[PDB]
UniProtKB/Swiss-Prot annotation, chain A:
Species annotation: Homo sapiens
Origin superkingdom: Eukaryota
Family: Belongs to the mitochondrion-specific ribosomal protein mL65 family.
Protein name as annotated: Large ribosomal subunit protein mL65
Subcellular location: Mitochondrion
Assembly, per entry: Component of the mitochondrial large ribosomal subunit (mt-LSU). Mature mammalian 55S mitochondrial ribosomes consist of a small (28S) and a large (39S) subunit. The 28S small subunit contains a 12S ribosomal RNA (12S mt-rRNA) and 30 different proteins. The 39S large subunit contains a 16S rRNA (16S mt-rRNA), a copy of mitochondrial valine transfer RNA (mt-tRNA(Val)), which plays an integral structural role, and 52 different proteins. mL65 forms a heterodimer with mL37.
Tissue: Heart, skeletal muscle, kidney and liver. Lower expression in placenta and peripheral blood leukocytes.
Curated annotation (Swiss-Prot), chain B:
Subunit details: Component of the mitochondrial large ribosomal subunit (mt-LSU). Mature mammalian 55S mitochondrial ribosomes consist of a small (28S) and a large (39S) subunit. The 28S small subunit contains a 12S ribosomal RNA (12S mt-rRNA) and 30 different proteins. The 39S large subunit contains a 16S rRNA (16S mt-rRNA), a copy of mitochondrial valine transfer RNA (mt-tRNA(Val)), which plays an integral structural role, and 52 different proteins. bL32m has a zinc binding site.
Compositional bias of kind Basic and acidic residues: 91-103
Chain intervals for the UniProt region annotation (Disordered): 86-108
Entry's family note: Belongs to the bacterial ribosomal protein bL32 family.
Protein name per the record: Large ribosomal subunit protein bL32m
Protein's gene: MRPL32
GO cellular component labels: mitochondrial inner membrane; mitochondrial large ribosomal subunit; mitochondrial matrix; mitochondrial ribosome; mitochondrion
Cell compartments where the protein resides: Mitochondrion
Organism name: Homo sapiens (Human)
Segment of the intact protein contained: 79 to 186 of 188
Broad class of where this protein is predominantly found: mitochondrion
Swiss-Prot record, chain C:
Source organism, top-level taxon: Eukaryota
Residues with the Phosphoserine modification: S24
Organism: Homo sapiens
Protein name per the record: Large ribosomal subunit protein bL34m
Localization, UniProt: Mitochondrion
Assembly with partners or alone: Component of the mitochondrial large ribosomal subunit (mt-LSU). Mature mammalian 55S mitochondrial ribosomes consist of a small (28S) and a large (39S) subunit. The 28S small subunit contains a 12S ribosomal RNA (12S mt-rRNA) and 30 different proteins. The 39S large subunit contains a 16S rRNA (16S mt-rRNA), a copy of mitochondrial valine transfer RNA (mt-tRNA(Val)), which plays an integral structural role, and 52 different proteins.
Gene transcribed to yield this protein: MRPL34
Signal peptide (residue range): none
Portion held of the full protein: 48 to 92 of 92
Entry's family note: Belongs to the bacterial ribosomal protein bL34 family.
Swiss-Prot record, chain D:
Keyword Protein biosynthesis tagged: no
Tissue: Detected in adrenal gland, mammary gland and adipose tissue.
Gene Ontology MF: a single term: protein domain specific binding
Organism: Homo sapiens (Human)
Keyword annotations of the record: Mitochondrion, Ribonucleoprotein, Ribosomal protein, Transit peptide
Keyword Mitochondrion set for record: yes
InterPro entries: Ribosomal_bL17, Ribosomal_bL17_sf
UniProt protein name: Large ribosomal subunit protein bL17m
GO BP annotation list: mitochondrial translation
Family membership: Belongs to the bacterial ribosomal protein bL17 family.
Primary localization class, coarse: mitochondrion
RNA sequence: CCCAAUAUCUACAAUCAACCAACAAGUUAUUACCCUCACUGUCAACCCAACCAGGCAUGCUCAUAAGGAAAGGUUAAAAAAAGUAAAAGGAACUCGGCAAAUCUUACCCCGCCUGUUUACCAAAAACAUCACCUCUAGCAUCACCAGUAUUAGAGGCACCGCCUCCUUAAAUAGGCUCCACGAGGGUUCAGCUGUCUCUUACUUUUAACCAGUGAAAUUGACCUGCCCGUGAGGCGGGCAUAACACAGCAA
């Protein structure tokens, strides 16, 4: 009956693994979006070069 | 406020060279009786500690090269073995971190 | 708060201190000639 | 006045103090030996000891699991705590960590300290031995050992 | 970084532009030419503030996929700064409920209202302002104005309507009509609270110590005491008096 917390990296930390996990956070924000409108909104709202 | 008069070199010398401001001679230095380097009593021989940190760093570099990436703290003990040292009968089931130089005399 | 009265602008700088503005009036030609006499190597802005 | 206050003051407040000590303790559990400023290590030694105490209770206990969840930040170390450290000290009932002072830091000349968990694999710290038992004063004291033992 | 010439035109808004409703009223026909991509910006941690918790227009992300580090090490003295908590009492503080905590009420003076002002001590009871009144002016192509007496300029006043003893235990305080509004001024009810009776604890910065880097006002010379008198560390008469840092205080 071992409740081991998961083996994941941290969210708020300033490293590379934290950056990847925040990438997964917004990608899971789009996976859990039902309208194609919102999927395209979230998947293109950040304007970069 | 502000000074009313310059202070002479005499007063400044009686302040700057007062004993309370001098650097005290340290009564607790000696020589590592075996190793023969300077040290304070309550502190580690600096040369010995450096020669230990070098080996710790080399061992840890091997550990990193073997564990691959981050988040890989093993769940078993670890033993480090130098050249021509077969894993002893007590160290089976413990991760081995091979090194390629003769074991230091100070490593027991 | 003061001290930032110079908000640079190339159009303004070339319009109100430039070669053509000096040469568009006798006073400006006098200015250019003074600065030619004193030896300057920056006659006009 | 600060009579009977056992906790140092460090960081930007109490919370930052707990977080600093938490990072030190995580580094200690991950590498089993760390060099840090002396006062911070002296503050963290008690926490490392009690962490091993909580880890002895074992995985099944939930209070210990929550505590080790808070006090370890990269969770790969929580296995270790409950399967390499706490088992290692099944015999010792106290004093799992040794703390030494080392040459002051080059840059800011702070008072340093190496702290490690007893029994690790690393090359051993150059501990200071006592005087050999065969020295003059020790020999005279050994003679007194004998002569007092026979009398009693 | 532009455009071949000439004539013609060019009455009706924009507001999801359709319903209602308004006022501040918002290019081509002919003639000439069958030519092709040259030239410049493109960097950065950046610019104006002597180096900087300041200043800096627009588009998009609205809490971050981007960007960063509030603690050189230590100890936990005073005084100072910011914050959190507080017994009973709740303005007795004080010039004044300034600050803080809590959210209610009532009136009075001034000004009608929104607005504007003394960049850097005054935001107001001052300026402006609709409304009213007075004075001047019969009119062309550079303002008033491509206007014309219901117009233009210059002044005063300030819509509109009406006319030309109580309070407190105690009190020097408060008590032309005219809604609405005010970081305006004065007063009051109730609450609230460390404002206070009367302070206390903890945290952070400062602080003190170790290490690095390292100013400025000020300075006749100083081997820089106290009391009484004279007119005051320095004169006189008494007293005191081994030298030397460090942290405080402000006669
Ligand atoms: Mg670019
Ligand atoms: Mg980032
Ligand atoms: Mg600190
Ligand atoms: Mg910092
Ligand atoms: Mg500091
Ligand atoms: Mg109270
Ligand atoms: Mg106003
Ligand atoms: Mg006002
Ligand atoms: Mg210093
Ligand atoms: Mg006197
Ligand atoms: Mg002093
Ligand atoms: Zn040694």
């Amino acid at each position: 009956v071992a409740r081991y917390p998961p083996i994941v990296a941290s969210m708020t930390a300033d490293s590379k693994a934290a950056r990847l996990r925040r990438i997964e956070r917004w990608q899971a924000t789009v996976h859990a979006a039902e309208s194609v409108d919102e999927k395209l909104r979230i998947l293109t709202k950040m304007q970069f070069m | 406020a502000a000074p009313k008069n310059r202070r002479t070199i005499e007063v400044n010398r009686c302040r700057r060279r007062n004993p309370q401001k001098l650097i005290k001679v340290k009564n607790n230095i000696d020589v590592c009786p075996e190793c023969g380097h300077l040290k304070q009593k309550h502190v580690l021989c600096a040369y010995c500690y450096e020669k230990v940190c070098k080996e710790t760093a080399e061992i840890r570099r091997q550990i990193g090269k073997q564990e691959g990436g981050p988040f890989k703290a093993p769940t078993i003990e670890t033993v480090v073995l130098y050249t021509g040292e077969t894993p002893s009968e007590q160290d089976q089931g413990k991760r081995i971190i091979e090194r390629d130089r003769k074991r230091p005399s100070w490593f027991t | 708060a003061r001290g930032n009265e110079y908000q640079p602008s190339n159009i303004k700088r070339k319009n109100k201190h430039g070669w053509v503005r000096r040469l568009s009036t006798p006073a400006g030609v006098q200015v250019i000639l003074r600065r030619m006499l004193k030896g300057r190597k920056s006659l006009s802005h | 006045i600060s009579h009977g206050r056992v906790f140092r003051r460090m960081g930007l407040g109490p919370e930052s103090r707990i977080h600093l000590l938490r990072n030190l303790l995580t580094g200690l559990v991950r590498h089993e030996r760390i060099e840090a400023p002396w006062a911070r290590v002296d503050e963290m030694r008690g926490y490392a000891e009690k962490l091993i105490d909580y880890g002895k209770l074992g995985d099944t206990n939930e209070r210990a699991m929550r505590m080790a969840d808070f006090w370890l930040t990269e969770k790969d170390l929580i296995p270790k705590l409950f399967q390499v450290l706490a088992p290692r000290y099944k015999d010792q009932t106290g004093g799992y960590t040794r703390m030494l002072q080392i040459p002051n830091r080059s840059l800011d000349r702070a008072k340093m300290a190496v702290i490690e968990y007893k029994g690790n694999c690393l090359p051993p710290l150059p501990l200071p031995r006592r005087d050999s038992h065969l020295t003059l004063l020790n020999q005279l004291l050994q003679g007194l050992r004998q002569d007092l033992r026979q009398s009693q």
